[PDB]
Amino acid sequence: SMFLPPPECPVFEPSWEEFADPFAFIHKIRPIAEQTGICKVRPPPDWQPPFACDVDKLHFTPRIQRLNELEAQTRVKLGGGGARDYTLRTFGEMADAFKSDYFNMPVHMVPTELVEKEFWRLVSTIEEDVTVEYGADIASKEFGSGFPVRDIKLSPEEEEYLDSGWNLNNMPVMEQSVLAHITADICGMKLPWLYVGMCFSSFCWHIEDHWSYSINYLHWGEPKTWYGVPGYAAEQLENVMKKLAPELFVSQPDLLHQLVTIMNPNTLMTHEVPVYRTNQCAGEFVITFPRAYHSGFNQGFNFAEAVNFCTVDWLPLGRQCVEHYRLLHRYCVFSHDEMICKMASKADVLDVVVASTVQKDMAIMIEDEKALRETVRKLGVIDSERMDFELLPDDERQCVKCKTTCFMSAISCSCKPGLLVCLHHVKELCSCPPYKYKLRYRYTLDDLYPMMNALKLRAE
Numbered sequence: 517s518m519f520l521p522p523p524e525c526p527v528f529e530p531s532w533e534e535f536a537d538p539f540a541f542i543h544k545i546r547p548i549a550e551q552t553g554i555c556k557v558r559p560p561p562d563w564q565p566p567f568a569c570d571v572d573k574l575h576f577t578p579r580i581q582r583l584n585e586l587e588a589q590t591r592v593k594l595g596g597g598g599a600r601d602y603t604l605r606t607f608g609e610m611a612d613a614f615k616s617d618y619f620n621m622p623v624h625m626v627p628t629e630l631v632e633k634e635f636w637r638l639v640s641t642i643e644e645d646v647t648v649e650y651g652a653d654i655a656s657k658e659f660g661s662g663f664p665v666r667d668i669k670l671s672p673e674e675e676e677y678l679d680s681g682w683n684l685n686n687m688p689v690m691e692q693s694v695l696a697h698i699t700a701d702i703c704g705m706k707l708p709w710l711y712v713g714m715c716f717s718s719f720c721w722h723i724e725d726h727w728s729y730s731i732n733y734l735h736w737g738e739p740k741t742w743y744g745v746p747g748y749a750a751e752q753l754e755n756v757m758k759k760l761a762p763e764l765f766v767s768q769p770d771l772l773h774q775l776v777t778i779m780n781p782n783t784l785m786t787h788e789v790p791v792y793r794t795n796q797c798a799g800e801f802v803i804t805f806p807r808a809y810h811s812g813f814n815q816g817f818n819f820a821e822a823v824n825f826c827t828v829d830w831l832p833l834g835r836q837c838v839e840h841y842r843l844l845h846r847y848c849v850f851s852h853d854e855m856i857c858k859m860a861s862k863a864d865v866l867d868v869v870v871a872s873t874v875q876k877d878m879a880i881m882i883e884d885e886k887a888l889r890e891t892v893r894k895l896g897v898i899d900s901e902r903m904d905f906e907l908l909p910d911d912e913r914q915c916v917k918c919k920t921t922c923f924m925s926a927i928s929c930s931c932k933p934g935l936l937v938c939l940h941h942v943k944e945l946c947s948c949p950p951y952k953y954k955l956r957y958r959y960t961l962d963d964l965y966p967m968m969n970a971l972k973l974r975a976e
């Protein structure tokens with residue numbers, strides 16, 4: 517045997533009743549699905565959103581992909597990056613001819629088992645040099661969501677699906693999520709991405725920014741094959757990866773140079789990393805859990821739509837993730853503390869389970885901040901001044917040393933205008949004596965305790 521398929525991940529078939537509320541359902545399956553990292557969700561037979569579009573008027577700029585195991589690729593950036601151009605129809609014609617010519621078979625007579633074995637053969641063989649193309653970008657005027665959105669008059673059926681929880685345009689900005697409260701520009705993370713696939717086009721092993729959840733819907737076409745690893749095994753996987761492809765682990769100059777790669781799940785299984793698989797067919801959802809590594813490839817021409825989200829469950833993990841970024845010197849997409857304080861400042865209109873969970877995260881934030889400020893005072897930093905960090909562009913408030921986005925506090929020095937360090941890296945700013953430094957802070961401890969009290973009242 518040259519490829520042993522991993523065991524299958526969990527598959528859920530909710531009733532209409534269960535399927536009514538997405539967040540309730542995800543909370544239900546969570547103890548099972550978080551053991552496997554990914555899971556598949558089949559909607560009720562009824563639930564059939566209308567996909568409709570003109571294949572001649574949708575155009576997009578294709579990305580090109582070489583298919584070599586352990587070779588470095590860079591995560592897709594929101595920028596089009598292209599002079600070349602396909603309509604959905606001309607891409608479909610390219611994609612079907614490619615698959616048909618590769619196997620000398622009609623496109624739907626190629627078994628999924630065989631495409632999977634062939635994918636892993638061709639990525640491991642050096643002389644084979646297959647390149648494929650694919651589409652990836654957030655919605656725009658030239659290529660929009662596959663779900664119904666408001667604007668054009670809509671049919672009664674379209675109106676049914678316009679407000680669904682499972683309409684992925686809605687899911688980021690619903691109530692039991694926490695990304696919706698963020699006022700910062702985080703386009704890449706709260707807007708759905710649109711993916712046009714062809715045979716063998718693939719996505720490298722990765723986890724979502726800030727260890728968020730994600731959910732992917734296959735609108736139409738041939739299936740999408742997935743591999744997933746549970747969150748508790750993320751560091752095992754990373755150690756296996758570091759050993760075999762250490763170049764992917766050199767320091768990131770920014771978030772547009774994140775390096776990722778294809779790697780055979782059998783390799784992971786040999787090093788005792790648990791891995792699960794699934795084929796996602798048209799009309800099905802795949803959900804990924806916090807810090808669950810995933811990868812996959814398309815069986816043929818298809819169209820998927822995916823979005824990030826964060827439940828109240830995720831809040832403690834969000835804080836651990838930012839700490840982990842600090843240890844690695846990795847850039848943040850947003851400030852976690854800034855998001856917590858924003859929610860606290862809206863305590864009266866918050867859902868009450870949300871208020872209760874924000875309260876507990878804020879209590880940890882405040883006790884850590886108390887300890888850090890005492891430490892830098894003992895270093896001889898005496899002068900201080902309030903500062904509205906949320907007004908600075910992100911690139912003007914990153915720690916010089918660990919790149920974290922400052923919000924609660926930072927240290928500055930008149931000696932190096934415009935530069936900041938977080939309170940973990942006070943000794944990294946410059947060589948002036950500590951009495952020349954200034955502590956810049958968003959809130960006094962006395963501002964903070966009443967903010968947390970408002971949450972306590974709302975939670976009762």
Ligand SMILES: O=C1Nc2ccc(F)cc2[C@H]1O
Nearest residue numbers: 592652711713718719732820
């Ligand atoms: O379903 C997919 N996920 C994903 C992720 C990143 C990519 F560049 C491309 C894809 C799609 O094929």
Ligand SMILES: [Cl-]
Nearest residue numbers: 583638641644
């Ligand atoms: Cl190859």
Ligand SMILES: [Mn+2]
Nearest residue numbers: 722723724730
């Ligand atoms: Mn993903």
Ligand SMILES: [Mn+2]
Nearest residue numbers: 842843917918
């Ligand atoms: Mn350090």
Ligand SMILES: [Zn+2]
Nearest residue numbers: 915918938941
């Ligand atoms: Zn720092």
